Amino acid sequence: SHHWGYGKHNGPEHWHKDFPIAKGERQSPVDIDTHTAKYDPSLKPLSVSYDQATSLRILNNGHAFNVEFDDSQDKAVLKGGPLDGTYRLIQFHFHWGSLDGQGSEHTVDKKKYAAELHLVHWNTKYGDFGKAVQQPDGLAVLGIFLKVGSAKPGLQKVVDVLDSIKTKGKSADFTNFDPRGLLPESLDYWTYPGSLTTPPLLECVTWIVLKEPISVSSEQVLKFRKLNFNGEGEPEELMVDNWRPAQPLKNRQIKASFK
Ligand SMILES: [Hg+2]
Ligand SMILES: [Zn+2]
């Protein structure tokens, strides 16, 4: 990691040299063993309130693409469930595979989905994202699995802008995108305490992983796979397999919101 990435020489097995927390006590993702996960009656109802979300821009950062939100006001927020207080949406992104049989970060009884959507939120008690990532309860990431089947209509606007952000460092205006169109019907979830799944791997995250996947079409995920990890005018390296494998569960319990 000389810069970190997803290749043989810079990928997840190397991250620990620059980021020793990679071998920490609460790393993500994990495998979700559905039989061992326990219903938790202490969880409150989950509230995903995205009606006033204001997207701004879409960016290829060289590892994935981020759809960024204006988080300067109390707008798109996550609350309830395992969370204490209010968490504000700052960005979402995906992780995906070279083939439909892999791509997710979390696994469910060892099953890998084709991709995984991460809606990233910071705890408003800490003022900003940067202060939030110095806290054990600074972030909440809502994770949603993607399987290949029917198209997700609400994803198409993302897909259709990807040609403008092919390479690392490119961005495009991306206003008026409604992340409600990326959610499944059910909010049933699993939750556990973990980390960022990319460097700096900080152990700040309450993970909330929905049980119900969304379906996206083969054509939609094929367009993800046309993105590039490299920058413009550099040798093409397709942006595929940008997922970290499951990490040791260590001294954690995964709780279920459902019976
Ligand atoms: Hg960060
Ligand atoms: Zn992620």
UniProtKB/Swiss-Prot annotation:
GO MF term list: arylesterase activity; carbonate dehydratase activity; cyanamide hydratase activity; zinc ion binding
The record's free-text note on cofactor binding: Zinc. Can also use cobalt(II) with lower efficiency, but not copper(II), nickel(II) and manganese(II).
Alpha-carbonic anhydrase domain span: 2-258
Residues under site feature: Fine-tunes the proton-transfer properties of H-64: Y6, N61, N66
Record-listed Zn(2+) binding positions: H93, H95, H118
InterPro entries assigned to the protein according to its UniProt record, in alphabetical order: CA_dom (IPR001148), CA_dom_sf (IPR036398), Carbonic_anhydrase_a-class (IPR023561), Carbonic_anhydrase_a-class_CS (IPR018338)
Outcome of substituting L196 to E/H/R: Strongly reduced CO(2) hydrase activity
Effect of G143R: In OPTB3; complete loss of activity
Phenotype upon changing E116Q: Strongly reduced activity and sulfonamide affinity
GO biological process terms, semicolon-separated: angiotensin-activated signaling pathway; carbon dioxide transport; morphogenesis of an epithelium; neuron cellular homeostasis; positive regulation of cellular pH reduction; positive regulation of dipeptide transmembrane transport; positive regulation of synaptic transmission, GABAergic; regulation of chloride transport
Keywords: Acetylation, Cell membrane, Cytoplasm, Disease variant, Lyase, Membrane, Metal-binding, Osteopetrosis, Phosphoprotein, Zinc
Top-level taxon of the source organism: Eukaryota
Name of the top EC class for this enzyme: lyase
Reactions this protein catalyses: hydrogencarbonate + H(+) = CO2 + H2O; urea = cyanamide + H2O
Chain positions with N-acetylserine modification: S1
GO CC entries: apical part of cell; cytoplasm; cytosol; extracellular exosome; myelin sheath; plasma membrane
Gene3D superfamilies linked: Alpha carbonic anhydrase
Record's subcellular location: Cytoplasm; Cell membrane
Cofactor(s) in the UniProt record: Zn(2+); Co(2+)
SUPFAM superfamilies with a match to the protein in the record: Carbonic anhydrase
Effect seen on changing H63A: Reduced CO(2) hydrase activity, rescued by 4-methylimidazole (4-MI). Reduced proton transfer. Enhanced proton transfer. Enhanced proton transfer capacity
The keyword Cell membrane is assigned to this record: yes
Family: Belongs to the alpha-carbonic anhydrase family.
Subunit description: Interacts with SLC4A4. Interaction with SLC4A7 regulates SLC4A7 transporter activity. Interacts with SLC26A6 isoform 4 (via C-terminus cytoplasmic domain).
Known role: Catalyzes the reversible hydration of carbon dioxide. Can also hydrate cyanamide to urea. Stimulates the chloride-bicarbonate exchange activity of SLC26A6. Essential for bone resorption and osteoclast differentiation. Involved in the regulation of fluid secretion into the anterior chamber of the eye. Contributes to intracellular pH regulation in the duodenal upper villous epithelium during proton-coupled peptide absorption.
Name the UniProt record assigns to this protein: Carbonic anhydrase 2
